[PDB]
Amino acid sequence: SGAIYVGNYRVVNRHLATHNDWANLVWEDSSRDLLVSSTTAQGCDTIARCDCQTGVYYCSSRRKHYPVSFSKPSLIFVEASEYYPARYQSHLMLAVGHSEPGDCGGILRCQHGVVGIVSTGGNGLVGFADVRDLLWLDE
Ligand SMILES: NC(=O)[C@H]1CCCN(C(=O)Cc2ncc3ccc(Br)cn23)C1
Numbered sequence: 425s426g427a428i429y430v431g432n433y434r435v436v437n438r439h440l441a442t443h444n445d446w447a448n449l450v451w452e453d454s455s456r457d458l459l460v461s462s463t464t465a466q467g468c469d470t471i472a473r474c475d476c477q478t479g480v481y482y483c484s485s486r487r488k489h490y491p492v493s494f495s496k497p498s499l500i501f502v503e504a505s506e507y508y509p510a511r512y513q514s515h516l517m518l519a520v521g522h523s524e525p526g527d528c529g530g531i532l533r534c535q536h537g538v539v540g541i542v543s544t545g546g547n548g549l550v551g552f553a554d555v556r557d558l559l560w561l562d563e
């Protein structure tokens with residue numbers, strides 16, 4: 425679990441969005457596993473606007489942060505799950521690092537700010553949904 429809180433927005437994994445997220449919907453994209461909802465309070469986070477390919481993510485299943493080298497956002501095949509049919513997920517970045525079911529929502533950061541959130545993984549890989557192209561989160 426986990427979310428990004430920036431301005432009057434909350435960014436979560438679309439498959440973990442709550443009834444309240446859907447009632448306050450701003451934007452969602454199944455192909456990215458992202459949903460953005462509106463908030464009443466001002467958020468604590470800031471968003472990176474960069475092309476970094478290294479950073480640090482939070483791994484809830486280890487209660488620890490780990491450094492990672494990750495691929496640029498791209499279209500990557502994701503096998504069927506209870507939440508989605510077998511499909512290509514867009515704007516996804518992969519890295520070698522531990523993740524297991526339950527780690528979705530952990531934040532990836534570089535020196536410029538928040539880069540994305542954990543969205544998939546397995547077998548020593550971790551995959552992050554990128555948010556750096558969503559320039560409207562800043563206004
Ligand atoms: N983005 C998606 O389509 C995910 C929706 C939830 C389901 N998806 C998964 O990957 C579930 C899953 N099985 C093994 C692992 C290991 C690490 C992590 Br993080 C998640 N994992 C796929």
Ligand SMILES: [Zn+2]
Pocket residue numbers: 472473474475476534535536537
């Ligand atoms: Zn950066």
